[PDB]
């Protein structure tokens, strides 16, 4: 279809919003990375910003589907959280472009020079932000009640967990370029350190 | 302790963090510093070279804070948590400088980059000071037999990550921050699941 020609734009922007950043990237930069005119780019997206919201949209959606299915597993909460976290990681190791461009907005928060339709849309994705972290909070108390899990502040570890989770995109920047199997091994081992602990 | 160079450094580190480095300029720096337009330029070559100063200044600060906590006569688990607590208190109280120590496309000169290489060594050594502690920590049986490079790496970025949900929370007293960084450490190293 033409979903073929739009995703190329959003993949390109996802990988161009990263090295340069939004404020330091223009439509043309996308046009050059994609090898396409600047007219059709504006044909599919009415704004230099609207494009970013779409890569945002896809970034959650893509993760939104991938990690949700582990909302029920074989073990207690501990065993539920490990697999879903492993997904979130391997996801972000190949979805990397779309995932840097879902937490970037914090750098554009204060200025917030924006249209009034984009204010509603972006916030609509902000309250949708809360959904994903709540999903990760829920699988926690399932193991805490079972005792197979340690116990710590539920308003802290979720912040600490998601943060420790996405903290790895500030060290995988010059590490990309391997097999998706080799990404899964790390996604497993790292969730081990963050979950099963580094002490005895 | 009103000092001119340092106040220029904080105004920069502040703007450098919240305002994008790209979209935070010397003029942008001037408005929050209350200094003359060319005053900044008197001691600092260019926007970048302030970054060198601010990076270097707040970089060696954290190292002084945490080093005393690597030379204790204890185990890997308890000293590493000790150092990581100082890491977080540095981060929570020095958030502008601390984020800018790993915040670096522009037309850069070799000399301003040579210092950047010098800075990067400091960053690679503070972290290695964290790697050595874990090396004993699993050599002494108080820590899981976990891959060394990754465990030190994960913890370190785990501490540097407490900034992005903390930049909108920083108003509390040091009594709170010391009581906070400790919990932020426990599930960082101890983990969970019994």
Numbering used by the authors:
A (entry chain B): 5 to 204
B (entry chain A): 6 to 109, 115 to 204
Question: What do the authors report?
Answer:
The M. baixiangningiae DarR structure was solved by selenomethionine single wavelength anomalous diffraction (SAD) and refined to final Rwork/Rfree values of 18.5%/20.2% to 1.6 Å. This structure was then used to determine the M. smegmatis DarR structure. There are two M. smegmatis DarR dimers in the crystallographic asymmetric unit (ASU) and one DarR subunit in the M. baixiangningiae DarR structure. While the M. smegmatis and M. baixiangningiae DarR structures have essentially the same overall folds, the distances between their DNA-binding recognition helices differ (as measured by the distance between the two centrally located Tyr47 residues on each recognition helix). In M. baixiangningiae DarR the helices are separated by 50 Å while the distance between these helices of the M. smegmatis dimer is 41 Å.
Recently, DarR, a 201 residue, TFR regulator of a putative MDR transporter, Ms5347, in Mycobacteria was discovered and represents the focus of this work.
